[PDB]
A paper describes a structure:
Lysenin from the earthworm Eisenia fetida is a pore-forming protein that specifically interacts with sphingomyelin (SM) and may confer innate immunity against parasites by attacking their membranes (Bruhn et al., 2006; Cooper et al., 2001). The topology of the lysenin structural fold establishes it as a member of the aerolysin family of pore-forming proteins (Szczesny et al., 2011), which appears thus to be conserved from bacteria to annelids. Here we report the crystal structure of lysenin alone, and in complex with the sphingomyelin headgroup phosphocholine (POC), and with SM itself.
The crystal structure of lysenin was first determined in space group P6522, with one molecule per asymmetric unit (a.u.), by multiple isomorphous replacement with anomalous scattering (MIRAS, one SeMet and one Hg derivative) and then in space group P1 with four molecules per a.u. by molecular replacement. Residue Gln229 is the gate regulating access to the POC binding pocket: in the apo forms of lysenin, Gln229 is in a closed conformation, blocking the entrance to the POC binding site, but has opened in the POC bound state. Lys185 aids in defining the gate, as it is in a different conformer in the apo form, preventing interaction with the phosphate moiety. The elongated N-terminal domain consists of a 310 helix and 10 β strands, six of which belong to a highly twisted antiparallel β sheet.
Author numbering: 6 to 298
The structure:
């Protein structure tokens, strides 16, 4: 799969008390109970969901992911069962309605199973409805295993994966042009200009694969503020700090903070020739885009 990657991740699920009615009378009662299966406040145009909280080690808050297939293992009355919910089921929100006649001196209980895929509250994954006499005992349904397959951006291998660095606000790729007398970063529409990321003891590095002057390839911050590409050195001016934890992924919105100039970070600022600068108290958003075209 070139582009994105599927990962099975452990999700939290729960058996709620979906509806309760207690018929303390001597006559039977009719009740029109209505439920809504599927993901709550689901977006009609896109299937991509942004996380409101983490999903173990793979997902963290803000990460954009896609479902998938939620699978829950549970038990009710000493019998273990497995309920699955396919892609079209989790996104299409169905409304189910049926009458239920509660007998006299009894209680109707509708157990509702819900899953929480990193904020995505999937309502009524399954249903168990039991009638018990007053004052009888119930069988509380217990969840055993809750997992879900999710599709996320493919993993960026440091040193191998060729990428493009696009600005989040302006929506333009980082290109390399000659400023003064060495290669300097600017912003344009060219897709031919790629990069490759590395990580060492000093930090992250932005190597360009389209250098004008051979050897001068690692992105660094000059004293004047501008961005230039220089030869491989331990100099912290050419190392960087990425806000997102490893492993990095395709389509990740990241920010590059210089290791030498701690407060200063990679951003856009229309200068004399170039427009990609590293300025104090500024940290513009950049999207990592993996190449397969
Ligand atoms: Cl030079
Ligand atoms: Mg619980
Ligand atoms: Na798993
Ligand atoms: Na659970
Ligand atoms: Na109870
Ligand atoms: Na920004």
């Amino acid at each position: 799969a070139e582009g994105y990657e599927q990962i099975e991740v452990d999700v939290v699920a729960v058996w709620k008390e979906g509806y309760v009615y207690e018929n303390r009378g001597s006559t039977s009662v009719d009740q029109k109970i209505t439920i809504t299966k599927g993901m709550k406040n689901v977006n009609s145009e896109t299937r991509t969901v942004t996380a409101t909280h983490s999903i173990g080690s793979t997902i963290s808050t803000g990460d954009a992911f896609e479902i998938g297939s939620v699978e829950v293992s549970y038990s009710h009355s000493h019998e273990e069962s497995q309920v699955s919910m396919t892609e079209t089921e989790v996104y299409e929100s169905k409304v189910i309605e049926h009458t239920i006649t509660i007998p006299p001196t009894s209680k109707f209980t509708r157990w509702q199973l819900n899953a929480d895929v990193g904020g995505a509250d999937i309502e009524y994954m399954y249903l168990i409805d039991e009638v018990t006499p007053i004052g009888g005992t119930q069988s509380i349904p217990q969840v055993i295993t809750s997992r879900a397959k999710i599709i996320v951006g493919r993993q960026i291998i440091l040193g191998k994966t060729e990428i493009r660095i696009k600005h989040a606000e302006r929506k333009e790729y980082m290109t390399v042009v000659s400023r003064k007398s060495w290669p300097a970063a600017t912003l344009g529409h060219s897709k031919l200009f790629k990069f490759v990321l590395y990580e060492d003891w000093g930090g992250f590095r932005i190597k360009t694969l389209n250098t004008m002057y051979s050897g001068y390839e690692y992105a660094y911050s000059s004293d004047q503020g501008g961005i230039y590409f220089d030869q491989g050195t331990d100099n912290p001016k050419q190392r960087w700090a990425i806000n997102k934890s490893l492993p990095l992924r395709h389509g990740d919105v990241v920010t590059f903070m210089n290791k030498y100039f701690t407060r200063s970070g990679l951003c856009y600022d229309d200068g004399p020739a170039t427009n990609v600068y590293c300025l104090d108290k500024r940290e513009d958003k950049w999207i990592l885009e993996v190449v397969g075209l």
